[PDB]
Structures are given as structure tokens and as C-alpha cells.
Design a protein around this ligand. Structure first.
Ligand code: TPP
Lengths: 225, 120, 498, 212
């Protein structure tokens, strides 16, 4: 089979330089042109740039014109997308896609074999430990049936962090929200479970976080006031 | 300044049929949403159905799925409700509701009057 | 939007790009070129429609559009680099490959131009306005009775006998052999006119001339069968302008040969025969279309016709069309006899029938240009306007009837010009008040039925009046009866008005 | 450069329902459009190419049609695998790739009332310097619910922060967590702190309040 793979995406400063590598295992870039597609988290797909190793057609999009550059090599069968002086809009997933030349089966077939897609992020703040805060159900009023019990984590970087409830035992009713972009540049996230009021006073609830770059495991007990 | 009109109802049997209707006047409907609510003797402020836009379908409640049918006629600005064999545990008054948001988030300000519906 | 609209927007965009600089904004132009090239690939052309698709003779068409889209790619990849001079050479290469590859599966791209030259050149008949002075000159010298009560009655009966059978053959033969048969009919008319021996030869000449006066609808039907309905309006307008300009050029050329050039009438008909053989050659150089009117069903036509059976305005304009068309052809068939009656000058250059024909064609073109501009409500002021037009026609026929003066008939020539001002002023209005109610096939059917009833009325008046076994009346009492007839029509439409 | 609008941006159907996703172009684009199926988080896949053809690899329950500049994706029998985001992309030139907006389809689920629970923080954020209250909407449908955040009887807009979750694989319902982060100036306000939220399953917009 023929397929694509992307590498090089990580954390950069706003205005830094980053070189993405798109490799095509199987086919060569002299018979098919390569393309880059941006997808912001929450937004939709949008085009960035392309390159054709047959002639050389480095024509870019109007939002990224004169700010990015691309260079493809057929001996290594790869494409380097070098990006300098970035902005905050480029926090996105970049897909490297194959698309053929005119005519016939290469061109009329669209972007058929999308790659795995690399992920780039733009943030002024570096990696730091998440601040974890409880969210108590306030069982003094509006009780009798069930309620909710949560953890609000904030001021962390990067995006992937996981929240476990009672070391992953209680998995029924767990809602973990996506990392919404805080206006201070950092990330914020909420997790919550549904707790019946009869089991609230007996079962002691803990709340642990697992963050892979920053070596921290904050396990806080959650309880009403 | 919008207003609603409705009709229908009657003492029906379990296994019969009924047609509720709601029309509106004051503002065009094809860029808004409409909804059907319920009020029982003893309870208050229940839900029946909702109709979003012109190119989409209706969305029902937890206990009326597969039993009711909600259409929408944008030419005469009339939303129907095909009651098909209502159980006698739903002897309640249905209300009509207009929306004041094009994103159908639930900006509800004006309702109807009511229609007496009782099964058996 | 199958092949020809994409071809037209591609030609227009290429003409834009050819005269444009500053290539930063030709990217929209080049991608519109690309869209017009890619949309016209699955088009299935009509010269290829008779052949089966996915054939090796179809691969040259797809390879031509392949190299077309490839050179559009070569243009736009050089236009995205900020260059302005490579796009012009790429457009020149695009022009050369468009002339070479695609034009093999395109038959003729001057179809509007060839129809304009056919309307401007093949309608030139300089002996048309001098038929009656040729029949009543020193060559053969037919008498007035033999040209009044014996030749044009055979023309009326022959117009009936070629309107009733030959209309189906006109609709059936896809209109290129119909125009070829019309050209052969012109050849037969001028060969019987140049080799006349008796009166029955001229009767056979009018028998062949009835086909020529009856096949005028076949030209517009050929336009509708060739030009698409998304192009029929403008091309039909330029073609009608070309036909009117060709008739005017024919009458002006007849005046330049007869009056100015002092060319004899036999040499005039020699020139007419030469230009009509040229018209036969141009009819041989036509293109046969496919989508005919009534052969390329009945229940849908009857269902759409049942809503237009007893309409009052449609019946009013239809009966007016029948009555005033019968009156128009009975004036035209005898007005040349009147012109040779009042002023029987034996000199060839002193015959000004062609100048009256040119002025009548010009005033008819003006009144046809000043017919569709009437933005007046037709509720109340319709029947009174019809009564006024018929009263004007009665006044002009009465002026033509009692004129026995050599110096006044000049103005009476202009009165016949004004007769076109009393006829062509309402012919586009009578077309607009019928065509805007039914489909175009039913429109042609209703105008055919109206021409049929006008031919019935003309045949009845010909059978009663000019027949020597019935009334047996000369042309002066015929014109007096025509003046009384238009006066009675004025009285009828005035009592219908108020 | 050009635009490519995609109208039914929020659809919903059950298992085995025919859906039609339309897409309108700006220019007179020829019959070369691309319909893509991207799972949430994963990579896109070519579903329909050239506006009519079926790709070798996608099942036979997918098709499309062209009407001028209006392209249409049609799904006859909606598999439960086929709940993803469908993207419309005209491909006319190499450098005119203009995607649509994405039509994230949903499961036809009965509209239930949102469980609306307000949560104040503990005494740790007042010793930290940044207060943050939240309002949770659990087990509701559809995604379109509007929180208003009535603080001191006023809709504090601009400082709110919403975050919807993906569709649950257990019961196909939604959760929202609106977060209001305020400074030390939240401390000296009045003794009422509420959030008002409205939803189609709610008759009246529910206002959840707390003190101190
Ligand atoms: C007795 C007689 N009169 C006239 C003619 C010739 N003729 C018959 S009809 C006609 C004119 C054709 O009608 P018109 O409406 O003027 O056609 P158009 O010029 O508009 O194309 C002529 C010149 C003739 N051959 N014999």
C-alpha cells in the first residue's frame, strides 16, 4: 500500500520557526503533487500550500502568503514545510495530502490518501503544572436524588491531559470536556461525574490528573462543604 | 409583538387520532423555530416537540418518540401535530411556542393560550 | 450550457485576457477559462451524437480538451508567480491549440455570420420590384385584363395549393432541402419569366412563385431549429435585421440598375437569375439541423390549446390578422398593376416602383422598430386604434383608387409606403399579442391557421370578384370594392369599439 | 479566493435515514467536487470525488449529484459508523482548494431537559487570586443551549467561556461546561451569583443561583 506520514509538529513560540516533514511511503512525489491542509480545533478544514516535484509550482494561500515556504525532494521522497514568524491562528492540525496531475485518474480523483496529520500549537507560555480545584455538589440544598461532582483544572500546557476518577474505577457518567482556550494564553478543562446522594456520604471521591510532558500527578479529594 | 393561534382538542379515545395546529402572525417563520410544550393538572412546564428550520426535521421528547408526528408548512406558517393513539396518562393542555433566535438556542418569549386535550 | 455556452464564455474570457495586462487579477479569468474548458468535456456534441460514445473516434475530442486544460495549467502556474508576460505567450499557444485540436469536432463557427450573409446576399432580387413593367413592356406586352384577371388569380389559388400540402413537407425535411426547393422555385420563376410564351407560362410562373412567398416562415423555423433557445433572441433579431437590410439592398440595387444604370429589363432579369443561382449555391452551402418543429404529443398540445380557444383578445387579434392580411395581399398583388396602369411610361428608367419598394421596406422597418415600444394598456384603446388603422387603410386605398394624374401617383407611391405604415405598425404587436400566450410550437400552429384563414378569405374574394364567369369586373371597380371593404371593416371595428 | 458555502451545518438522523448535504459554489465550477468524511480527531477520507463517482474503498451507501453549482451528498441507509463531519471541497485548480464549513451529523435523539448544576469554587482560588465559577449542563440535546450568566442582574457577556463535549457513545447526549473566570473584584459584589441558561427542552430559562 501507499500512504503518508507527518512529523515535526510540537510546541513553538509565537514568531518562531518550525520545519514539518511529510514523507510518502510507497509512491514518489514526481508522479503526484503534495498539499497541506489546516484544521483549527473547533473550526473546519482550510488549505495552506502545495508543491509539485515535476515542475515546481510553490503557490500559496492568501492568508499564508509570504510567511511560509515549501521544498520537496524526490531522492528522499519527502517535503519540508518551513514556517517562520507564526501567529496565534496557526494552532492547528496540518494534514499532508496527495493529489494527482492532469489528466484522468490522478487529477479527477481528489485528495484520496490523507496522512496521519501533524499537530502544531502556538502559545507564549511554556509548560507548567495544572492548578486543580474541586467542584462540590452543595448537598445542603437541592438534594434527594442525584447531583454532580467535578474538577476544574486550569493554567496548564500542552493540551493532552487526562482525568481519572477513583483510579479509573468509576467510569459511568464521566464527562471530560475539551481544553477550551483560556484568554490568558493557558488551557482550562472541566471533568465531572454523576453521584447519587445516597452514595455521596459513604463513598469518598478522589480526582487524579495525568499529564505526560509535565511530570505531575495531582490527586485531590473532592467533598462538599 | 408576535402572536400565536391554535385549535383542536377534544375528549379522545386510546387508539384514536387527533390533529393539533399552531399558526403565527407578526413575523415570518421560515428563519425561526417553533415548539410544542405541555402542562398537566398538578404539574407544570413540560415538553412535547420542536421544529428547527425548513430543510430539517422535528425533534421529540423522551416519551413521545414514535407516537407523535410534527410537520411544518412554511407557506401558510402552520405547524401541525398528529396525535396517534395517545395514552390516558397524558390528559394535559398543549402550548405553542415561538423562538426569537436564528441559532435556535431557545430564546422563548411568547407562547399561546392552550388547548384542552383529554384521553377517555 | 451543454457545449456552446461554455464555448462562448471561454471565447469572451480569452478576448478579455488577450487585451489585458497586470496579471495579478487574471487568475479569476484563467480559472473561469479552466471551468469553461472542464465543463465542456462531457458535452456529447451533435456531430458526435450520431456516433456511439466511448469510441476511438471520440478520444481525439477528449485529447483536445486534455491539451486545452493542460495549457491552461501551464498558463496559470506561470500566472501565480507574479509574471505578466508568460500568460500572453501561453494564451497564444492556447489560441493555436484551440484552433487545431478542438475545431476538428466543430463544423462551422460563423453560423450567425453565414446567416447574416444569407439574409443580406441571397435575398437580393433586383427584378422583384419590376415584374409588372417587364410583363407590360415592349417585350411581350400583356394586356391589363390578362395580367389582372388571369395571372394573379392563379397566384392566389397556387398560394392556397402550396400552403395546404407543402407546409408539412416544409416542417418535415429539416429546412435545408426546403430552402433548396425554394431556390429552385426562384430559378423556375425567372426561367419562366425570361422564356415566357403565353399567359399559362406566367400562370405556371406564379405557381412556382407561391412556394417562394409561402416559405418565408421556413427561414425563421430554420433559425429556431439551428440556433439554441438560449441564443435565439439576439441571433433572431440580427437575422431579421439582415433580411430587412437585404430586401432594402435589393430594392436600392434595382433602382441603381434600372433608373441610374439604365439597364434593360431583360438584362435586369438576367442579373436576378444570376443572383438567384448564387442563392441556390448558398442554399447548397447550408447546414442541416436536427431538432425540427413538428417531427422532432397531440394530447399535451390540445390541453395547452384548450385555454386559448375562446379568448376575446386573442380572437380579436386573430380575426384582425386574417382580415387585414387578406386585404394586405390583395393590395400588394394589384398595386404593381395600378402603378403600371396610372403611369404607363415606355421608358425603362422612368419607372420608380423600386424606390417605392425601398421606402416601403424602410418605413416598415421603422414601424416594426416602433411597435414593441408601445407601453400602453390595451384594455380600452385597442379596438378604437384598430378602427383608426383600418380607416387609414381605407383612406389610402381610396387615394389609390381615384388617382388619374401622372404627377400625383408619385405621392401615391409614398401612400403605398404609408400603407406599410398602416400595416407593419401592428404586425409586431399582433405577433406579441399571440406569442406571449402559448408555446412556440402552438404559436407557429396559430399563425399557420391564421395564414390559412387569410388565404381562405383571399381565395373567396378572388373566386367571386375577378372571375369572368361571375362578376367579371376590371381593376378600377376592384379597387373601389377594396376601398368599400376597408370602410366596412372600419365601421365594424368602430361599432366594436364604441 | 472563492467561497464554497455548505448549508446544512447541523444535521441529525437515526440509523437508516436518507440525508442530503448540499453545497453551493460561487463560480461556475465544473463537475469536480470532493466530499470528505473526517472522524472527530482522526484523518479525513475521500468519500465522493467528481460529484458523481463512488470511490474504491467507501461503501455503496454513498453517492452525489450536481445541479449547476449545487453539489449534493446523499446517504440512503445511514450506518452508525457514518457519524462524522462531512466536508465539501471544490477542486478546480491546484491553488484554488476552498473547503466548506463541515456538517457534523448527529444521532436522532429525544430532546431532554438539561441538568443544570452551578458550581462555585472552594476557598483555594480566593487565596490564589483568580476566582472561577462554572455552570454544568448535563444529559441534553441538541448542542445549541445559551447561557447568560446573570451576575448582579446583568448578562456579563465577553467574560463567559463555553466548552461543549463530543457526542457520547453510550446514550448519545451532550454536556456543556460554561466557565466564568473573574478577578478579585468578584469578591466585593452583591450577595447573589447566578447563571441563566435556555434550551429547547426547557420551557423557561433555568436560573441557578448561589450566595457568598
Ligand atoms: C400580378 C403580380 N403582382 C405582384 C407580383 C410579385 N409579388 C407578389 S407578392 C410580392 C411582395 C411579397 O410580399 P411582402 O410582404 O412585401 O414580402 P417582404 O418584402 O416583406 O419580404 C411581390 C413583389 C407578381 N408576380 N404578380
Amino acid at each position: 500500500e501507499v500512504q503518508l506520514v507527518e512529523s515535526g509538529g510540537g510546541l513553538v513560540q509565537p514568531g518562531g520557526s518550525l520545519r514539518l516533514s511529510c514523507a510518502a511511503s510507497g509512491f514518489n512525489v514526481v508522479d503526484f503533487s503534495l498539499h497541506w491542509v489546516r484544521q483549527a480545533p473547533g473550526k473546519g478544514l482550510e488549505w495552506v500550500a502545495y508543491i509539485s516535484s515535476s515542475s515546481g509550482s510553490t503557490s500559496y494561500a492568501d492568508s499564508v502568503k509570504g510567511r511560509f515556504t515549501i521544498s520537496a525532494d524526490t531522492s528522499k521522497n519527502t517535503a519540508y514545510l518551513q514556517m517562520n514568524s507564526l501567529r496565534a491562528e496557526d494552532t492547528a492540525v496540518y494534514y499532508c495530502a496527495r493529489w494527482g496531475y492532469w489528466p484522468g485518474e490522478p487529477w479527477w480523483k481528489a485528495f484520496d490518501y490523507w496522512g496521519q496529520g501533524t499537530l502544531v500549537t502556538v502559545s507564549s507560555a511554556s509548560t507548567k503544572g495544572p492548578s486543580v480545584f474541586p467542584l462540590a455538589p452543595s448537598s445542603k440544598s437541592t438534594s434527594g436524588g442525584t447531583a454532580a461532582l467535578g474538577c476544574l483544572v486550569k493554567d496548564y500546557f500542552p493540551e493532552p491531559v487526562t482525568v481519572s476518577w477513583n483510579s479509573g474505577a468509576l467510569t459511568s457518567g464521566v464527562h471530560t470536556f475539551p481544553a477550551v482556550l483560556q484568554s490568558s494564553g493557558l488551557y482550562s478543562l472541566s471533568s465531572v461525574v454523576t453521584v447519587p446522594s445516597s452514595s455521596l456520604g459513604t463513598q469518598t471521591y478522589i480526582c487524579n490528573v495525568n499529564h505526560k510532558p509535565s511530570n505531575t500527578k495531582v490527586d485531590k479529594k473532592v467533598e462538599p462543604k | 409583538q408576535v402572536q400565536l393561534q391554535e385549535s383542536g382538542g377534544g375528549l379522545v379515545q386510546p387508539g384514536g387520532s387527533l390533529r393539533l395546529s399552531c399558526a403565527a402572525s407578526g413575523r415570518t417563520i421560515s428563519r425561526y423555530a417553533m415548539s410544542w410544550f405541555r402542562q398537566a393538572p398538578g404539574k407544570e412546564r413540560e415538553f412535547v416537540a420542536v421544529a428547527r428550520r425548513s430543510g430539517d426535521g422535528a425533534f421529540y421528547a423522551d416519551s413521545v418518540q414514535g407516537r407523535f408526528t410534527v410537520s411544518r408548512d412554511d407557506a401558510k406558517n402552520t405547524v401541525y401535530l398528529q396525535m396517534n393513539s395517545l395514552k390516558p396518562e397524558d390528559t394535559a393542555v398543549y402550548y405553542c411556542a415561538i423562538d426569537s433566535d436564528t441559532f435556535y438556542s431557545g430564546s422563548y418569549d411568547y407562547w399561546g393560550q392552550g388547548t384542552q386535550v383529554t384521553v377517555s | 450550457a451543454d457545449l456552446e455556452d461554455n464555448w462562448e464564455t471561454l471565447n469572451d474570457n480569452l478576448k478579455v485576457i488577450e487585451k489585458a495586462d497586470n496579471a495579478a487579477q487574471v487568475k479569476d479569468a484563467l480559472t473561469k477559462m479552466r471551468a469553461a474548458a472542464l465543463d465542456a468535456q462531457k458535452a456529447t456534441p451533435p456531430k458526435l451524437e450520431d456516433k456511439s460514445p466511448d469510441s476511438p473516434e471520440m478520444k481525439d475530442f477528449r485529447h483536445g480538451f486534455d491539451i486545452l486544460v493542460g495549457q491552461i495549467d501551464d498558463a496559470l502556474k506561470l500566472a501565480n508567480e507574479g509574471k505578466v508576460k508568460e500568460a500572453q505567450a501561453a494564451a497564444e499557444q492556447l489560441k493555436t491549440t484551440r484552433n487545431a485540436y478542438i475545431q476538428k469536432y466543430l463544423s462551422w463557427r460563423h453560423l450567425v455570420c453565414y446567416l447574416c450573409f444569407y439574409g443580406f446576399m441571397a435575398q437580393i432580387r433586383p427584378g422583384e420590384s419590376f415584374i409588372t413593367p417587364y410583363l407590360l413592356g415592349p417585350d411581350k406586352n400583356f394586356t391589363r385584363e390578362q395580367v389582372t384577371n388571369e395571372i394573379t388569380p392563379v397566384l392566389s389559388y397556387s398560394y392556397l395549393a402550396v400552403l395546404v400540402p407543402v407546409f408539412l413537407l416544409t416542417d418535415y425535411l429539416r429546412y435545408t432541402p426546403v430552402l433548396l426547393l425554394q431556390g429552385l422555385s426562384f430559378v423556375s420563376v425567372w426561367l419562366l419569366l425570361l422564356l415566357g410564351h403565353s399567359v399559362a407560362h406566367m400562370q405556371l410562373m406564379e405557381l412556382f412563385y407561391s412556394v417562394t412567398m409561402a416559405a418565408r416562415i421556413a427561414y425563421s423555423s430554420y433559425i429556431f431549429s439551428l440556433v439554441r433557445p438560449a441564443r435565439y433572441q439576439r441571433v433572431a433579431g440580427y437575422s431579421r435585421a439582415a433580411v430587412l437590410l437585404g430586401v432594402f439592398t435589393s430594392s436600392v440595387l434595382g433602382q441603381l440598375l434600372v433608373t441610374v444604370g439604365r439597364v434593360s429589363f431583360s438584362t435586369l432579369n438576367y442579373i436576378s437569375l444570376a443572383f438567384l443561382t448564387f442563392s441556390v449555391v448558398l442554399a447548397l452551402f447550408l447546414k442541416r439541423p436536427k431538432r425540427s418543429l413538428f417531427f422532432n404529443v397531440l394530447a399535451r398540445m390540445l390541453r395547452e390549446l384548450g385555454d386559448s380557444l375562446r379568448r376575446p383578445q386573442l380572437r380579436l387579434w386573430s380575426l384582425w390578422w386574417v382580415f387585414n392580411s387578406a386585404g394586405y395581399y390583395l393590395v400588394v398583388y394589384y398595386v404593381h398593376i395600378l402603378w403600371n396602369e396610372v403611369d404607363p411610361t415606355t421608358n425603362s428608367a422612368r419607372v420608380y416602383n423600386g424606390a417605392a419598394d425601398a421606402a416601403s421596406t424602410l418605413l416598415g422597418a421603422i414601424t416594426s422598430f416602433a411597435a414593441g415600444f408601445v407601453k400602453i394598456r390595451w384594455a380600452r384603446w385597442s379596438k378604437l386604434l384598430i378602427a383608426g388603422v383600418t380607416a387609414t387603410q381605407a383612406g389610402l386605398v381610396f387615394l389609390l383608387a381615384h388617382t388619374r394624374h401622372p404627377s400625383s401617383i408619385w405621392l401615391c407611391y409614398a401612400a403605398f409606403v404609408l400603407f406599410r405604415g398602416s400595416y407593419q405598425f401592428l404586425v409586431p404587436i399582433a405577433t406579441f399579442q399571440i406569442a406571449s400566450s402559448l408555446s412556440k410550437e402552438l404559436c407557429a400552429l396559430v399563425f399557420g391557421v391564421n395564414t390559412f384563414f387569410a388565404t381562405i378569405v383571399k381565395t373567396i374574394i378572388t373566386f367571386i370578384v375577378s372571375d369572368v364567369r361571375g362578376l367579371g369586373l376590371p381593376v378600377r371597380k376592384q379597387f373601389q370594392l377594396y376601398s368599400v371593404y376597408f370602410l366596412i371593416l372600419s365601421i365594424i371595428y368602430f361599432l366594436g369599439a364604441m | 479566493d472563492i467561497q464554497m458555502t455548505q448549508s446544512p451545518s447541523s444535521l441529525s438522523a437515526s440509523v437508516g435515514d436518507r440525508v442530503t448535504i448540499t453545497c453551493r459554489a460561487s463560480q461556475s465550477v465544473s463537475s469536480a467536487v470532493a466530499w470528505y468524511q473526517q472522524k472527530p480527531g482522526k484523518a479525513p477520507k475521500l468519500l465522493i470525488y467528481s460529484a458523481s463517482s463512488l470511490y474504491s474503498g467507501v461503501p455503496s451507501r454513498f453517492s452525489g449529484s450536481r445541479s449547476g453549482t449545487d453539489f449534493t451528498l446523499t446517504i440512503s441507509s445511514l450506518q452508525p459508523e457514518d457519524f462524522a463531519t462531512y466536508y465539501c471541497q471544490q477542486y478546480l485548480y491546484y491553488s484554488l482548494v476552498t473547503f466548506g464549513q463541515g456538517t457534523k451529523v448527529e444521532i436522532k435523539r429525544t430532546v431532554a431537559a438539561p441538568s443544570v448544576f452551578i458550581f462555585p469554587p472552594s476557598d483555594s482560588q480566593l487565596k490564589s487570586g483568580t476566582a472561577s465559577v462554572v455552570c454544568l449542563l448535563n444529559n441534553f440535546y441538541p448542542r445549541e443551549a445559551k447561557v447568560q450568566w446573570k451576575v448582579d442582574n446583568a448578562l456579563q457577556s465577553g467574560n463567559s467561556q463555553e466548552s461543549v463535549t463530543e457526542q457520547d457513545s453510550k446514550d448519545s447526549t451532550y454536556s456543556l461546561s460554561s466557565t466564568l473566570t473573574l478577578s478579585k473584584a468578584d469578591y466585593e459584589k452583591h450577595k447573589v451569583y447566578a447563571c441563566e441558561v435556555t434550551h429547547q427542552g426547557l420551557s423557561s430559562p433555568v436560573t441557578k443561583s448561589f450566595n457568598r
